[PDB]
């Protein structure tokens, strides 16, 4: 159901809290990577621990479906896999470039994908496995398919390339003459749609078909998402879409008509937006303030 009130405080960093995600199917923890400090976890209310071993801010903090360890994508050319129970050192990927969002394949805890900003993507195990070089620009955001087995990449170019399980060659590369880029993108939880932000202030939605062409009128236009790395979100079993903006506002969306529902005035560009997989009406958001406002 729709979020309508700015309910709880959750005062995180005084810095940005530049990444928020959930444990899938168990809405117990969150993550918050600030600018200067390190990662904090809030529950539901409570706090657990810091994760020292970073120096720079963090782009994205992605879990696995094993859920015991998340993946930190810091600006400091270093990717660290942290346990949510102890917080130890599995790997330390000292890289060449500032890494983008760092994700994991839903089957294996071994299979593990790191995006870069020198136009490359590196697959790993529990240790290089296979490169990925088809984007011309810095790669911005990644996804996967239902239960993995393929892979989705999008860059500072307008291209989106579906790569496979350890295969360099794209099945489809998605480009027109009017697309700005695809800076962030999340799988719609019926695992057949394909939603992505784009800096025409619009959220495009493609299919997941072999005949992969887009569907009209499912484009979410009323935004100011132009110059910030803003996230997408999806409710339980796909009832709405929440997405932040740079008006210090959070905007929700329908599916069949795709129209504006709630223009909230949350007290700085609202960027990171997550739903609960348990609570069917509440949405966690954070902008660049650090105070994690829950709707």
């Amino acid at each position: 159901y729709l979020p309508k009130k700015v309910i709880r405080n959750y005062p995180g960093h005084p810095e940005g809290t530049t990444a928020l995600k959930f444990l899938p199917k168990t809405g117990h923890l969150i993550l918050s990577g600030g600018n200067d400090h390190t990662i904090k976890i809030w529950d539901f209310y409570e706090c657990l621990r810091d994760f020292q071993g970073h120096n720079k801010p963090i782009k994205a903090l992605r879990f696995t479906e094993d859920c015991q360890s998340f993946l930190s994508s810091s600006f400091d050319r270093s990717v660290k896999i942290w346990d949510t129970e102890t917080g130890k050192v599995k790997t330390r990927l000292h890289l060449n470039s500032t890494p983008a969002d760092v994700e994991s394949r839903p089957t294996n805890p071994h299979e593990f994908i790191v995006g870069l900003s020198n136009s490359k993507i590196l697959h790993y195990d529990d240790g290089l496995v296979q490169t990925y070089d088809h984007h011309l620009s810095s790669i911005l955001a990644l996804k996967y398919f239902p239960d993995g087995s393929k892979f989705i990449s999008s860059s500072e170019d307008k291209t989106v390339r579906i790569w496979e399980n350890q295969i360099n060659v794209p099945i489809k590369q998605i480009s027109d003459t009017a697309q700005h880029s695809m800076p962030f993108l999340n799988v719609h939880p019926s695992q057949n749609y394909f939603c992505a932000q784009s800096m025409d202030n619009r959220i495009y939605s493609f299919s997941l078909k072999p005949k992969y062409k887009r569907h009209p009128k499912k484009i979410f236009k009323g935004h100011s998402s132009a110059g910030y790395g803003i996230s997408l979100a999806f409710s339980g079993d796909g009832r709405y879409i929440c997405s932040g903006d740079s008006k210090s506002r959070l905007f929700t969306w329908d599916w069949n008509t795709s129209r504006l529902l709630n223009n909230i005035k949350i007290p700085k560009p609202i960027t990171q937006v997550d739903w609960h997989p348990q609570e069917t009406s509440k949405v966690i958001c954070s902008g660049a303030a650090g105070k994690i406002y829950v709707c």
């Binding site: 530049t18 720079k56 600006f75 620009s137 500072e156 003459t177 880029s181 110059g227």
Partner: protein, 49 residues
């Protein structure tokens, strides 16, 4: 239907391919420029001057 749709595709062909690739290149300039400002706004909320 096919021939009429191709005809109304070709009657829209107003700009040349050099003007088409210049609209393409200016679109790429605006996209790279807004990505650069996006990266700078991230690093400026970060504090890295």
């Amino acid at each position: 239907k096919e021939m009429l749709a191709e005809a109304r595709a070709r009657l829209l062909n107003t700009q040349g391919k050099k003007a088409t690739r210049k609209i393409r290149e200016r679109m790429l300039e605006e996209s790279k420029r807004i990505a650069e400002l996006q990266k700078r706004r991230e690093l400026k909320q970060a504090g890295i001057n």
